[PDB]
């Protein structure tokens, strides 16, 4: 059966096959490494049966030796592509964070697309393996780190409705959120200001709800609205220094929270009507 099948490793290292996957009407085509597991089991069988005194043909031993001299690049490629597929499925689980890791996905896809041109017997196979494995491990740990911080950020945002109306606890919660965004900015993820602004509209809506609750609970008027209105905004690109521009009051504090009033401006009219 082995001398009928005629295994052997040749061609380029990657292989794009298309399978029909259940649950999806179209075919989903995936990426696999051009190294069949039958090659590895053939290597194991040749190393096993040779000691057993069973005479194996010369072409089989030749294929086994060529496989064993090409194995360490192949197993590393298999591990890299499996880790990449697992991490891409993990970021496809949470669609809210796809734009945050576009740069790393672009880098890894570029390293794959460069590596699709390499044949198995090429001289370039030694440093490309190390570079691909390093990049894929870095991408995977960056994704896991961002998953943890995004879960914590969602927890801290959802803790804002149950937070009591005072400037101290609000300032502490926004300080924690600003520190988490600072941690995002230190590791230089892609599309940070867009995601920060998308967070900031949600947090301004939540602060508008809390200001509504405080205003109807009021029904010294000026002092109660400075608890929310003097809260510092979330700054995305704060690590940069040197530009001698000053942000206005609208982009430093939540001074547009009155426009985010869910019942319209009538709650402010109802507040002023009692005076």
């Amino acid at each position: 059966k082995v001398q009928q099948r005629n295994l052997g490793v040749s061609g380029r290292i990657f292989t794009i096959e298309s399978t029909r996957v259940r649950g999806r009407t179209g075919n989903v085509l995936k990426l696999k490494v051009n190294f069949l597991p039958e090659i590895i089991t053939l290597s194991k069988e040749v190393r096993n049966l040779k000691w057993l005194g069973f005479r194996v043909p010369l072409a089989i031993v030749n294929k086994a030796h060529q496989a064993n001299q090409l194995y360490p690049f192949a197993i590393s490629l298999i591990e890299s592509v499996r880790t990449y597929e697992r991490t891409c499925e993990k970021v496809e689980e949470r669609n809210t964070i796809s734009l945050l890791v576009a740069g790393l996905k672009k880098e890894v896809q570029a390293l794959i697309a460069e590596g699709i041109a390499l044949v198995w017997e090429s001289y370039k196979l030694d440093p490309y393996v190390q570079r691909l494995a390093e990049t894929v491990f870095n991408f995977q740990e960056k994704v896991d780190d961002l998953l943890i911080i995004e879960e914590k950020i969602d927890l801290e945002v959802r803790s804002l409705e149950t937070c009591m109306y005072d400037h101290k606890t609000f300032s502490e919660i926004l300080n924690r959120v600003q520190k988490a965004v600072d941690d995002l900015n230190l590791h230089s993820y892609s599309n940070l200001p867009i995601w920060v602004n998308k967070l900031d509209m949600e947090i301004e809506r939540i602060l508008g709800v809390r200001l509504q609750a405080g205003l109807r609970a009021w029904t010294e008027m000026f002092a109660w609205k400075m608890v929310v209105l003097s809260l510092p905004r979330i700054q995305s690109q704060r690590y940069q220094v040197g530009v001698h521009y000053e942000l206005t009051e609208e982009e430093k504090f939540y001074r547009n929270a009155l426009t985010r009033m869910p019942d319209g401006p009538v709650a402010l009219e109802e507040s002023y009507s009692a005076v």
Binding site: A102, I112, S190
Partner: peptide, 21 residues
């Protein structure tokens, strides 16, 4: 910004590059 492509169309294009060379 930065917008990495969808993986499916990217690796269909890479499949075409595999076939053409």
């Amino acid at each position: 910004e930065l917008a990495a492509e969808d993986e499916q169309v990217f690796l269909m294009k890479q499949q075409s590059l595999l076939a053409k060379q």
